[PDB]
Scaffold this motif. Structure first.
Motif, PDB file in Angstrom:
ATOM      1  N   UNK A   1     -16.029  -0.701  -1.947  1.00 24.88           N
ATOM      2  CA  UNK A   1     -15.224  -0.788  -0.739  1.00 24.88           C
ATOM      3  C   UNK A   1     -15.444  -2.123  -0.045  1.00 24.88           C
ATOM      4  N   UNK A   2     -14.407  -2.584   0.655  1.00 24.31           N
ATOM      5  CA  UNK A   2     -14.470  -3.885   1.309  1.00 24.31           C
ATOM      6  C   UNK A   2     -15.204  -3.811   2.641  1.00 24.31           C
ATOM      7  N   UNK A   3     -14.823  -2.854   3.492  1.00 26.91           N
ATOM      8  CA  UNK A   3     -15.498  -2.674   4.774  1.00 26.91           C
ATOM      9  C   UNK A   3     -16.960  -2.317   4.577  1.00 26.91           C
TER      10      UNK A   3
ATOM     11  N   UNK B   1       0.823  -1.206   0.000  1.00 23.69           N
ATOM     12  CA  UNK B   1       0.000   0.000   0.000  1.00 23.69           C
ATOM     13  C   UNK B   1       0.858   1.259   0.000  1.00 23.69           C
TER      14      UNK B   1
ATOM     15  N   UNK C   1      -7.753  -3.358   8.844  1.00 18.59           N
ATOM     16  CA  UNK C   1      -7.645  -2.515   7.658  1.00 18.59           C
ATOM     17  C   UNK C   1      -6.657  -3.094   6.657  1.00 18.59           C
ATOM     18  N   UNK C   2      -5.527  -3.607   7.144  1.00 21.66           N
ATOM     19  CA  UNK C   2      -4.532  -4.174   6.240  1.00 21.66           C
ATOM     20  C   UNK C   2      -5.037  -5.442   5.566  1.00 21.66           C
TER      21      UNK C   2
ATOM     22  N   UNK D   1     -20.054  -4.541   5.978  1.00 24.28           N
ATOM     23  CA  UNK D   1     -21.071  -3.965   6.845  1.00 24.28           C
ATOM     24  C   UNK D   1     -22.449  -3.999   6.209  1.00 24.28           C
TER      25      UNK D   1
ATOM     26  N   UNK E   1     -12.807  -4.059  13.724  1.00 20.95           N
ATOM     27  CA  UNK E   1     -12.246  -3.205  12.706  1.00 20.95           C
ATOM     28  C   UNK E   1     -12.964  -1.880  12.625  1.00 20.95           C
ATOM     29  N   UNK E   2     -12.480  -1.036  11.723  1.00 20.06           N
ATOM     30  CA  UNK E   2     -13.146   0.224  11.457  1.00 20.06           C
ATOM     31  C   UNK E   2     -14.365  -0.005  10.575  1.00 20.06           C
ATOM     32  N   UNK E   3     -15.074   1.077  10.284  1.00 17.95           N
ATOM     33  CA  UNK E   3     -16.273   1.004   9.470  1.00 17.95           C
ATOM     34  C   UNK E   3     -16.055   1.466   8.036  1.00 17.95           C
ATOM     35  N   UNK E   4     -14.840   1.873   7.676  1.00 19.84           N
ATOM     36  CA  UNK E   4     -14.570   2.427   6.359  1.00 19.84           C
ATOM     37  C   UNK E   4     -13.226   1.931   5.854  1.00 19.84           C
ATOM     38  N   UNK E   5     -12.928   2.274   4.605  1.00 22.17           N
ATOM     39  CA  UNK E   5     -11.672   1.924   3.961  1.00 22.17           C
ATOM     40  C   UNK E   5     -10.995   3.186   3.456  1.00 22.17           C
ATOM     41  N   UNK E   6      -9.695   3.297   3.712  1.00 21.32           N
ATOM     42  CA  UNK E   6      -8.869   4.350   3.145  1.00 21.32           C
ATOM     43  C   UNK E   6      -8.111   3.885   1.912  1.00 21.32           C
ATOM     44  N   UNK E   7      -8.367   2.665   1.451  1.00 24.89           N
ATOM     45  CA  UNK E   7      -7.618   2.079   0.346  1.00 24.89           C
ATOM     46  C   UNK E   7      -8.166   2.615  -0.966  1.00 24.89           C
ATOM     47  N   UNK E   8      -7.353   3.394  -1.677  1.00 26.33           N
ATOM     48  CA  UNK E   8      -7.753   3.995  -2.942  1.00 26.33           C
ATOM     49  C   UNK E   8      -7.015   3.391  -4.128  1.00 26.33           C
TER      50      UNK E   8
ATOM     51  N   UNK F   1      -8.352  -6.149   4.939  1.00 22.72           N
ATOM     52  CA  UNK F   1      -9.422  -5.798   4.021  1.00 22.72           C
ATOM     53  C   UNK F   1      -8.972  -4.867   2.907  1.00 22.72           C
ATOM     54  N   UNK F   2      -7.740  -4.355   2.961  1.00 23.72           N
ATOM     55  CA  UNK F   2      -7.222  -3.557   1.856  1.00 23.72           C
ATOM     56  C   UNK F   2      -7.141  -4.373   0.576  1.00 23.72           C
TER      57      UNK F   2
END
Ligand SMILES: Cc1cc2nc3c(=O)[nH]c(=O)nc-3n(C[C@H](O)[C@H](O)[C@H](O)COP(=O)(O)O)c2cc1C
Ligand code: SF4
Ligand code: SF4
Ligand code: SF4
Ligand code: FES
Ligand code: FES
Ligand SMILES: [K+]
Lengths: 41, 430, 87, 264, 214, 51
Positions: free
Chosen positions: F13-15, B363, D91-92, F19, D120-127, D94-95
């Motif tokens: 998105x995956x998350x 990443x 996060x890593x 969800x 885990x978190x509820x969102x992804x920062x993976x772009x 699910x990236x």
């Protein structure tokens, strides 16, 4: 004496130099410990 | 002494660093090697470990751990299993050449240090895990080992003592991660170069499940001269808790990139201007420096003006003294591209065991490539900072930390450069 | 690997006939006590409830997993067979 | 207190044997540490990094699946540092994990999905773009969609230690590291559906139980096994009056956690 | 680039002829003697390297032969061969040029070296020349960073090379004679290119600075 | 973990997909407890006692 490079014997090394040296070294080594098994299976 | 540097040639511990003086055994004996080594071995393990403790020598691997304490981890009596000394001759860090230089120009110092450290720990063999690309260096080391066996310095009578020792050389096959301690142990054991967790420490379970100690080539090579010349002398060099001499490689945009032995706590500016011939274009043209090999972050010119060359000094300057590999970048370079190439290196050399290092360094590689192009946004800078903080401290080995730290240094210092690239890209694509 | 669905005593009924609907192929049933999962905090509470309502019961003991010796250092043994060949 | 040491988790004061891991102490008190690669009947791997927990007055989180408690440790399982570590690891994963959840088979049976929702978190920062791995043909029983593998080596450890075939392994490095056989190998032994059991993601699914049902659909009846005189305990997962799946049960004195291929 | 999945081609089936020379059998015996009596599986890496040195590249029959000799599972041998990058699982050229492209080398302009090699050989990135004696690849740090514009051909390092320097090295290789390994353009091994500034004096002999009581 | 994400985020998105799946199959877990919530509905005080 000190103004010339003298590692020049690394120039004439073939592809089997390291393993030939190891084979030559195999007779100089002590007997090795055993784990009591032929292999970990 | 307040100031450090300008080391004397008679105090240089690594004579024949430049390939002169007949690297073979006869030249090693002329320069002073295998001298009073039988007296050292009969003096015994506790005296050698006390000598190391009084010298205050630290790891020269980049780890920074006290060598005397680390080697005195294994002063226990026998268990039933043998004990092993393992030497790390992998040297996979960018910027680092010192281990290659000492292995191809003074290998009998490495062999004598293997013997002395193996006696200090109490052991029967030293496995020198050399890098696979150093075929000529490995062959020279094997020539030196064969000469030592012929002279009787190894094997069934260690230099005439009643101690039995063996020295083996095992070559790698092209993995930077196999320079790690436990990964190197696994590579010797014949598996993949994946580091194992700690505990168990290598002093309890090492190669073949035996108590082993893994040490750097420079560490074991300065070991017998430390034992021979005192150790108060070695502590007399350098500052407190950062003592002795150090092989500095200087590469990048310098006039004469070179490997030189210099006293610890020498100024960075003094080291470059004295041994590398200065930055190409001048100290004013200097932009940034990586003082360690590649695991350490950047330091700009402003803090490079007065910084010293200690572990503690670089920790104060928010860096580290790793392999002492000063990579110099002048103002006419792409600092973002250099850091992105380092992240490319860490992505290519990740062993893939941990999900944090594996996925996060891939990443990081993609994010840094987009930083170099310019198609990111300034929120992604803090996003990448948080990705680095997630990688660091959450991995099995320190490759994750060594990949997170250059990103952190780039974000910490050259953040307006990243923002300038992003705004230039945005205004040129709109 | 989660264990949160244990640790509560369930009472269920014996399964009766679920046949096939001639029109649509659905699962038709004839007994009302088919989906009768009842939750109890203790086995004795479940026994008392079953006895109070007058149902014959079969009660089986809780199957806790046995505590197991786990050591990471056994994967790199010097002589034992626990040495692995792959991390 | 002969060979018993006192360790604290969230202040509670449980006594454990020496060599007990942090995860075992936490589960002895009653807390289940998140995991992906640890299995109680497999060797410790320590690579998924989901079990990172904070010890009090210790700056570095430790892996609970592998770290043994020493003495007087205070395991802070619900601390901010531990929650941040779990979020980062999730996060890593699910990236690069593929978003295949509807076409998958671990609908309500996914440890990755459940531990994502819980820790885990509820969102992804993976772009960026996700990786993809070509599939294998390991047999007529185990369908391998290896794109969604999380490289946890549980199948490798099982097939090396319990099944003992030594045919699975990791080829490659880094993000390109892949699990399977390097050659076109027909992994067919008895006790080979247990990799379908122990694989937390849907990388190794059951080919006969391909797309037929979902765990919330399936009613579970706990029964025993025939066509083997071991008499292993099983769970029959039925749905709408039709037997859909046979899973193993847990009996430490008969079959432990797994069953054989014939009964599966 | 290279895939970590064997496709079982006719040129790389598990029936292609591989076997060790008898002297290679002796070398394997020496290696296994180097490792202890238990844990002979530690010899997988150098025996596989010896197989590569004998055969050029490493076919699947060579991997299976190493596994059979050392009584190690073939999957473990495949793990080692796929993990480590110095093992060629495809046939490479006679010389196998490897250009380091990490940060200090690209600071001292390894990109010019790579592009001049590319236009000299006519190959794009990582393929083989038609005469089957050159394969040009990018690699990471090779340990000679003070000699930053460097290259590795087989087991030899050629360092401090200009574009014309690497062109004439390639010309010498095509002519047939092996060029002189090491850094060219003045420096012997690693000293500064302005004369010696570090040792510059005869080293002291035995007994110098020996502490008392030893 | 309470509201479903947007459909574009779910499909990219995956998350978000995880969800979406869990909220539309299992639903969110409400922490245990009892409340009485009263709202001035037009007909009167409309109350929900939720346990
Ligand atoms: C990814 C990675 C690569 C490393 N590479 C090397 C190397 O090439 N040489 C080395 O001596 N140490 C290397 N190390 C550091 C070792 O952990 C360290 O050198 C070893 O513990 C020897 O200790 P010492 O420095 O006290 O001698 C590396 C560490 C990591 C995490
Ligand atoms: S941090 Fe990376 S290189 Fe180190 S053990 Fe984990 S996966 Fe391997
Ligand atoms: S394994 Fe789990 S997270 Fe992955 S696609 Fe399947 S259900 Fe989704
Ligand atoms: S296939 Fe499944 S069990 Fe095997 S390593 Fe991948 S996620 Fe783990
Ligand atoms: S459960 Fe401990 S690292 Fe995976
Ligand atoms: S970075 Fe190129 S040889 Fe080290
Ligand atoms: K599965």
């Amino acid at each position: 004496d000190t103004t010339t490079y003298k590692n020049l014997q690394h120039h004439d090394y073939n592809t089997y130099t390291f393993l030939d040296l190891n084979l030559d070294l195999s007779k100089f080594r002590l007997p090795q410990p055993s784990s009591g098994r032929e292999s970990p299976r | 002494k307040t100031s450090f540097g300008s080391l004397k040639d008679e105090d240089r511990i690594f004579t024949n660093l430049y390939g002169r003086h007949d690297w073979r055994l006869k030249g090693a004996l002329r320069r002073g090697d295998w001298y009073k080594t039988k007296e050292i071995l009969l003096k015994g393990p506790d005296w050698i470990l006390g000598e190391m403790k009084t010298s205050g020598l630290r790891g020269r691997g980049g780890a920074g751990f006290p060598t005397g304490l680390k080697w005195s981890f294994m002063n226990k009596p026998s268990d039933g299993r043998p004990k092993y000394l393992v030497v790390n001759a992998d040297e996979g860090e960018p910027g680092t050449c010192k281990d290659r230089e000492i292995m191809r120009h003074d290998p009998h110092k490495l062999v004598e240090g293997c013997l002395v450290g193996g006696r200090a720990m109490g052991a029967r063999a030293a496995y020198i895990y050399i890098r696979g690309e150093f075929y000529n260096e490995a062959s020279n080391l094997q020539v030196a080992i064969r000469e030592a066996y012929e002279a009787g310095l190894i094997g069934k009578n260690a230099c005439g003592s009643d101690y039995d020792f063996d020295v083996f050389v095992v070559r790698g096959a092209g993995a930077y991660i196999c320079g790690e301690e436990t990964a190197l142990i696994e590579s010797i054991e014949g598996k993949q170069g994946k580091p194992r967790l700690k505990p168990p420490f290598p002093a309890d379970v090492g190669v073949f499940g035996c108590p082993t100690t893994v040490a750097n080539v420079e560490t074991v090579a300065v070991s017998p001269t430390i034992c021979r010349r005192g150790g108060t002398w070695f502590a007399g060099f350098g500052r407190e808790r950062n003592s002795g001499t150090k092989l500095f490689n200087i590469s990048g945009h310098v006039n004469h990139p070179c490997t030189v032995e210099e006293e610890m706590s020498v100024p960075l500016k003094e080291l470059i201007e004295k041994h590398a011939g200065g930055v190409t274009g001048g100290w004013d043209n200097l932009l940034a420096v990586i003082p360690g090999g590649s695991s350490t972050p950047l330091i700009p010119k402003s803090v490079c003006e007065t910084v010293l060359m200690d572990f503690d000094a670089l920790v104060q300057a928010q860096t580290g003294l790793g392999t002492a590999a000063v990579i110099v970048m002048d103002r006419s370079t792409d600092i973002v591209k250099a850091i992105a190439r380092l992240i490319e290196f860490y992505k290519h050399e990740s062993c893939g065991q941990c999900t944090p290092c594996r996925e996060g360094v891939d990443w990081m590689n993609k994010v840094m490539a987009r930083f170099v192009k310019g198609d990111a946004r300034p929120a992604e800078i803090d996003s990448l900072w948080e990705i680095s903080k997630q990688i660091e401290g959450h991995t099995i080995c320190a490759l994750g930390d060594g990949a997170a730290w250059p990103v952190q240094g780039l974000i910490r210092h050259f953040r307006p450069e990243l923002e300038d690239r992003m705004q230039r890209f945005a205004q040129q694509h709109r | 690997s989660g264990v949160n669905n244990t640790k509560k005593w369930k009472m269920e009924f014996d399964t009766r006939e679920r046949w096939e609907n001639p029109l649509m192929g659905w699962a038709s049933t004839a007994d009302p006590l088919s989906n009768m999962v009842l939750t109890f905090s203790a086995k004795e509470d479940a026994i008392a409830f079953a006895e109070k309502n007058g149902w014959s019961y079969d009660v089986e003991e809780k199957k806790v997993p046995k505590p197991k010796s786990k050591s990471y250092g056994a994967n790199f043994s010097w002589n034992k067979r626990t040495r692995v060949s792959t991390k | 207190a002969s060979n018993l040491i006192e360790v604290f988790v969230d202040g509670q004061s449980v006594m454990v044997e020496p060599g007990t891991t942090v995860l075992q102490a936490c589960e002895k008190v009653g807390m289940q540490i998140p995991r992906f690669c640890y299995h109680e009947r497999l060797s410790v791997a320590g690579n998924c990094r989901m079990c990172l927990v904070e010890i009090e007055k210790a700056p570095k989180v430790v892996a609970a699946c592998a770290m043994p408690v020493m003495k007087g440790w205070n395991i802070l399982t619900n601390s901010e540092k531990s929650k941040k570590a779990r979020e980062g690891v999730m996060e890593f994963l699910l990236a690069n994990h593929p978003l295949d959840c509807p076409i998958c088979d671990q609908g309500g049976e996914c440890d990755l999905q459940d531990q994502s929702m819980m820790f885990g978190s509820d969102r992804s920062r993976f772009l960026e773009g996700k990786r993809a791995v070509e599939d294998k043909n390991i047999g007529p029983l185990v369908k391998t969609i290896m794109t969604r593998c999380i490289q946890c080596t549980r199948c490798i450890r099982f097939a090396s230690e319990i099944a003992g075939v030594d045919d699975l392994g990791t080829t490659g490095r880094g993000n390109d590291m892949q699990v399977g056989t390097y050659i076109e190998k027909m992994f067919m032994s008895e006790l080979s559906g247990n990799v379908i059991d122990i694989c937390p993601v849907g990388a190794l699914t059951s080919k006969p139980y391909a797309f037929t049902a979902r765990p919330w659909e399936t009613r579970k009846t706990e029964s025993i096994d025939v066509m083997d005189a071991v008499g292993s305990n099983i769970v029959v997962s039925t749905r709408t009056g039709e037997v859909m799946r046979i899973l193993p049960r847990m009996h430490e004195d008969i079959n432990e956690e797994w069953i054989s291929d014939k009964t599966r | 680039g290279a895939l970590f999945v064997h496709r079982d081609t006719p040129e790389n089936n598990p029936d292609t002829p591989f076997d060790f020379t008898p002297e290679n059998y002796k070398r394997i015996e020496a290696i296994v003697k180097n490792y202890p009596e238990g844990h002979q599986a530690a010899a997988v890496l150098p025996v596989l390297d010896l197989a590569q040195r004998q055969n050029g590249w490493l076919p699947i029959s060579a991997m299976n032969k190493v596994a059979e000799v050392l009584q190690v599972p073939p999957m473990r041998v495949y793990e080692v061969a796929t993990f480590y990058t110095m093992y060629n699982r495809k046939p490479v050229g006679k010389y196998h040029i490897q250009v380091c492209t990490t940060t200090p080398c690209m600071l001292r302009d390894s990109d010019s070296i790579l592009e001049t090699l590319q236009r000299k050989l006519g190959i794009k990135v990582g393929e083989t020349t038609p005469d089957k004696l050159f394969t040009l690849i990018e690699v990471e740090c090779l340990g000679a960073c003070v000699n930053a514009p460097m290259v590795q051909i087989n087991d030899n390092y050629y360092e401090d090379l200009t574009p014309k320097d690497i062109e004439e090295i390639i010309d010498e290789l095509k002519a047939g004679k092996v060029p002189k390994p090491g850094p060219r353009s003045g420096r012997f091994c690693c000293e500064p290119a302005g004369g010696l500034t570090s040792l510059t004096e005869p080293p002291k002999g035995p007994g110098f600075g020996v502490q008392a009581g030893l | 973990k309470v509201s479903p994400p947007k459909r574009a985020e779910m499909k990219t998105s995956m998350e978000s997909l995880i969800h979406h799946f869990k909220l539309y199959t299992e639903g969110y877990q409400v922490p245990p407890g009892a409340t009485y919530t009263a709202i001035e509905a037009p007909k009167g005080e409309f109350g929900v006692y939720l346990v």
